[PDB]
Design an enzyme around this catalytic site. Sequence first.
Site, PDB file in Angstrom:
ATOM      1  N   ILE A  41      -0.154   8.974  13.569  1.00 25.08           N
ATOM      2  CA  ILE A  41      -1.250   8.389  14.338  1.00 25.08           C
ATOM      3  C   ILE A  41      -0.932   6.972  14.812  1.00 25.08           C
ATOM      4  O   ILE A  41      -1.413   6.534  15.859  1.00 25.08           O
ATOM      5  CB  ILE A  41      -2.557   8.398  13.515  1.00 25.08           C
ATOM      6  CG1 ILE A  41      -2.951   9.835  13.181  1.00 25.08           C
ATOM      7  CG2 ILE A  41      -3.693   7.699  14.258  1.00 25.08           C
ATOM      8  CD1 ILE A  41      -3.346  10.021  11.745  1.00 25.08           C
ATOM      9  N   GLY A  42      -0.113   6.256  14.049  1.00 26.87           N
ATOM     10  CA  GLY A  42       0.269   4.909  14.424  1.00 26.87           C
ATOM     11  C   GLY A  42       0.526   4.005  13.237  1.00 26.87           C
ATOM     12  O   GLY A  42       0.605   4.463  12.099  1.00 26.87           O
ATOM     13  N   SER A  43       0.656   2.711  13.515  1.00 28.74           N
ATOM     14  CA  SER A  43       0.927   1.717  12.484  1.00 28.74           C
ATOM     15  C   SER A  43      -0.085   0.575  12.536  1.00 28.74           C
ATOM     16  O   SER A  43      -0.335   0.006  13.597  1.00 28.74           O
ATOM     17  CB  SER A  43       2.346   1.167  12.639  1.00 28.74           C
ATOM     18  OG  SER A  43       3.315   2.185  12.455  1.00 28.74           O
ATOM     19  N   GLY A  44      -0.668   0.247  11.386  1.00 25.39           N
ATOM     20  CA  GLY A  44      -1.635  -0.834  11.298  1.00 25.39           C
ATOM     21  C   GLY A  44      -1.026  -2.119  10.769  1.00 25.39           C
ATOM     22  O   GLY A  44       0.144  -2.411  11.030  1.00 25.39           O
ATOM     23  N   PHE A  69      -0.209  -2.876   7.723  1.00 19.84           N
ATOM     24  CA  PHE A  69       0.935  -2.445   6.927  1.00 19.84           C
ATOM     25  C   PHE A  69       0.998  -0.920   6.882  1.00 19.84           C
ATOM     26  O   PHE A  69      -0.028  -0.248   6.971  1.00 19.84           O
ATOM     27  CB  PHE A  69       0.886  -3.045   5.514  1.00 19.84           C
ATOM     28  CG  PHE A  69      -0.316  -2.625   4.711  1.00 19.84           C
ATOM     29  CD1 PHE A  69      -1.525  -3.290   4.844  1.00 19.84           C
ATOM     30  CD2 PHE A  69      -0.232  -1.573   3.813  1.00 19.84           C
ATOM     31  CE1 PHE A  69      -2.632  -2.907   4.103  1.00 19.84           C
ATOM     32  CE2 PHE A  69      -1.334  -1.183   3.068  1.00 19.84           C
ATOM     33  CZ  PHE A  69      -2.536  -1.853   3.214  1.00 19.84           C
ATOM     34  N   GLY A  70       2.210  -0.381   6.774  1.00 20.77           N
ATOM     35  CA  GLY A  70       2.413   1.054   6.672  1.00 20.77           C
ATOM     36  C   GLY A  70       2.202   1.822   7.964  1.00 20.77           C
ATOM     37  O   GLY A  70       1.807   1.254   8.981  1.00 20.77           O
ATOM     38  N   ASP A  76      -8.010  -9.106   8.381  1.00 18.81           N
ATOM     39  CA  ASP A  76      -7.653  -8.498   9.662  1.00 18.81           C
ATOM     40  C   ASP A  76      -8.806  -7.709  10.271  1.00 18.81           C
ATOM     41  O   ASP A  76      -8.604  -6.646  10.857  1.00 18.81           O
ATOM     42  CB  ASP A  76      -6.419  -7.602   9.514  1.00 18.81           C
ATOM     43  CG  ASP A  76      -5.755  -7.297  10.844  1.00 18.81           C
ATOM     44  OD1 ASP A  76      -5.765  -8.173  11.737  1.00 18.81           O
ATOM     45  OD2 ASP A  76      -5.224  -6.177  10.997  1.00 18.81           O
TER      46      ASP A  76
HETATM   47  C1  LIG Z   1      -4.624   3.352  14.060  1.00 17.99           C
HETATM   48  C2  LIG Z   1      -4.391   2.717  12.678  1.00 17.99           C
HETATM   49  C3  LIG Z   1      -4.880   1.258  12.698  1.00 17.99           C
HETATM   50  C4  LIG Z   1      -2.870   2.712  12.419  1.00 17.99           C
HETATM   51  C5  LIG Z   1      -5.096   3.497  11.569  1.00 17.99           C
HETATM   52  N1  LIG Z   1      -4.950   3.234  10.288  1.00 17.99           N
HETATM   53  C6  LIG Z   1      -5.705   4.094   9.512  1.00 17.99           C
HETATM   54  C7  LIG Z   1      -5.625   3.905   8.075  1.00 17.99           C
HETATM   55  C8  LIG Z   1      -5.131   4.883   7.203  1.00 17.99           C
HETATM   56  C9  LIG Z   1      -5.065   4.630   5.829  1.00 17.99           C
HETATM   57  C10 LIG Z   1      -5.484   3.402   5.310  1.00 17.99           C
HETATM   58  C11 LIG Z   1      -5.970   2.418   6.176  1.00 17.99           C
HETATM   59  N2  LIG Z   1      -6.433   1.123   5.756  1.00 17.99           N
HETATM   60  S1  LIG Z   1      -5.962   0.407   4.269  1.00 17.99           S
HETATM   61  O1  LIG Z   1      -4.608   0.798   3.922  1.00 17.99           O
HETATM   62  O2  LIG Z   1      -6.302  -1.003   4.307  1.00 17.99           O
HETATM   63  C12 LIG Z   1      -7.097   1.140   3.116  1.00 17.99           C
HETATM   64  C13 LIG Z   1      -6.669   2.025   2.130  1.00 17.99           C
HETATM   65  F1  LIG Z   1      -5.378   2.358   2.013  1.00 17.99           F
HETATM   66  C14 LIG Z   1      -7.578   2.582   1.233  1.00 17.99           C
HETATM   67  C15 LIG Z   1      -8.934   2.261   1.320  1.00 17.99           C
HETATM   68  C16 LIG Z   1      -9.370   1.376   2.306  1.00 17.99           C
HETATM   69  C17 LIG Z   1      -8.453   0.821   3.197  1.00 17.99           C
HETATM   70  F2  LIG Z   1      -8.901  -0.027   4.134  1.00 17.99           F
HETATM   71  C18 LIG Z   1      -6.033   2.683   7.541  1.00 17.99           C
HETATM   72  F3  LIG Z   1      -6.508   1.725   8.353  1.00 17.99           F
HETATM   73  C19 LIG Z   1      -6.450   5.040  10.208  1.00 17.99           C
HETATM   74  C20 LIG Z   1      -7.369   6.109   9.807  1.00 17.99           C
HETATM   75  C21 LIG Z   1      -7.867   6.239   8.523  1.00 17.99           C
HETATM   76  C22 LIG Z   1      -8.725   7.296   8.319  1.00 17.99           C
HETATM   77  N3  LIG Z   1      -9.090   8.167   9.281  1.00 17.99           N
HETATM   78  C23 LIG Z   1      -8.566   7.970  10.509  1.00 17.99           C
HETATM   79  N4  LIG Z   1      -8.924   8.852  11.517  1.00 17.99           N
HETATM   80  N5  LIG Z   1      -7.710   6.960  10.805  1.00 17.99           N
HETATM   81  S2  LIG Z   1      -6.165   4.808  11.895  1.00 17.99           S
END
Ligand SMILES: CC(C)(C)c1nc(-c2cccc(NS(=O)(=O)c3c(F)cccc3F)c2F)c(-c2ccnc(N)n2)s1
Lengths: 249, 247
Positions: A16-19, A21-22, A127
Amino acid sequence: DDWEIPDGQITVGQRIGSGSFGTVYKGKWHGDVAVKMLNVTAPTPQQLQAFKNEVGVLRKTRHVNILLFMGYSTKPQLAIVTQWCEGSSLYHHLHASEFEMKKLIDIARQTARGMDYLHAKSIIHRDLKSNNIFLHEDNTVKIGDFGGSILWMAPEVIRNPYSFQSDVYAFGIVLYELMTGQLPYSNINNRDQIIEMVGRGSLSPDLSKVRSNCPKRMKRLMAECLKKKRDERPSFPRILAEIEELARE
Amino acid sequence: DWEIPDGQITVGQRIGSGSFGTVYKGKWHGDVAVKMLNVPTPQQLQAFKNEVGVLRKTRHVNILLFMGYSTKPQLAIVTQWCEGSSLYHHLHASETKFEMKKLIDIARQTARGMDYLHAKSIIHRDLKSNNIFLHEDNTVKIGDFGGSILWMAPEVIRPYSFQSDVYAFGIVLYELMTGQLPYSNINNRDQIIEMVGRGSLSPDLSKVRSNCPKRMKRLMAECLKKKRDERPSFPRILAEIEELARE
Ligand SMILES: CC(C)(C)c1nc(-c2cccc(NS(=O)(=O)c3c(F)cccc3F)c2F)c(-c2ccnc(N)n2)s1
Ligand SMILES: CC(C)(C)c1nc(-c2cccc(NS(=O)(=O)c3c(F)cccc3F)c2F)c(-c2ccnc(N)n2)s1
């Protein structure tokens, strides 16, 4: 008490992409899940340590407006499993798509609840963007992607500058998005101009851009959240109280 | 730790009493549900920690979110607040008309939660349509862990296992497809207890609606097996619903 998901149970899928981290993929585990993995051949001790730290932070979150941490795995790659959100981010709805005020207020309220919850646990988001706010089934705000983010950066962050006050400022920008339907600094297309000007203390979001029906209490709250000096910004308990109140009144 | 200090929770209106405890709507960083336990003794406190210990092990979208516990002013458990009503209310009170797609998604979501619970080796012991909360009308929330004999497996009537949870899920499936509660033409509790318990009575499958997919009718019948060991496991259950969901 232990959230380690034994590998082989998780069926990873489309990326789906990268935020912050990870990298995240849609996955299969007792239903739909989101899987954030650090794709390296072998994690450097720095990465393994940071992994343990963030998981320790995430496992302390249990709130309807915070993205649900479900578990983690360490082999072959470090991974964090979360719930799967249906729909798109608040950013997409606001800026990449074709909401009435009452919904806008409710979105602001749910986000305040989540942030208020995080701060009570002594957790700083670092963030917060409309990009990080997922509208699950279009009805439930889910805050994710903890620590292009320039627009949501407080003046002191643009110049460890991270605090509860910088989260509040980012939240103020999100309110601005909700109430105007626009990203701040539309007439400035230069990254370094905004960096200089916002950091210089000169530039702040244009509140004249708010919609006519946007409540004045909301407009005032927005201005309070966007204070250039950090110790002049309101805390989330007061922020939540004001929104929840005005939602009734 | 998940202890919420005295004074942080504002208790509102009483909602009702369930399998254990009494539920109120409350305020704590937004809306919460507060389950007051009627009470502590040294031993009551241990039993309280044991149940909280079980609840603290659940992190799933289809399971009611545990948020914390209170020790003062009294023993209490805090969960998220669900908007809307139970699946029971929609099926049998509201007469909410669901397209077949919704009914199967609900069945699928409930299966997801139960499979999760069982992977954690947790038995619900009291699954029924009013234990299944449709939060914002879309997301299934299973709560109220272990008068409600309609979902009781024959062996339970005469005991609690994953198989009896499966049977209870079979009755929920029956509710979804039939729109009715089992044994509607028999309004006699003692009778149903005797007849279901000895195996002479089972839900009338003739009452399933025409639009109901035939694969679900089979799965429903497999779940409702009178003999406990002839019932499928939730991983298998989830797959067949998941497979049928493609359409
Ligand atoms: C596009 C982008 C920005 C790359 C995304 N990241 C996540 C995503 C997936 C997993 C974790 C976290 N955020 S995190 O890693 O900070 C986190 C946890 F790992 C656990 C609990 C809360 C939390 F914020 C995410 F943002 C996304 C995501 C998560 C759940 N459902 C969907 N449809 N997308 S989309
Ligand atoms: C009395 C009645 C109608 C049966 C209810 N019980 C709860 C309720 C409230 C709190 C906990 C549990 N179930 S529980 O006590 O078994 C439990 C936890 F305490 C924690 C996590 C899961 C879980 F199932 C509940 F069923 C209800 C409830 C829960 C959340 N939102 C709303 N609107 N109602 S309604």
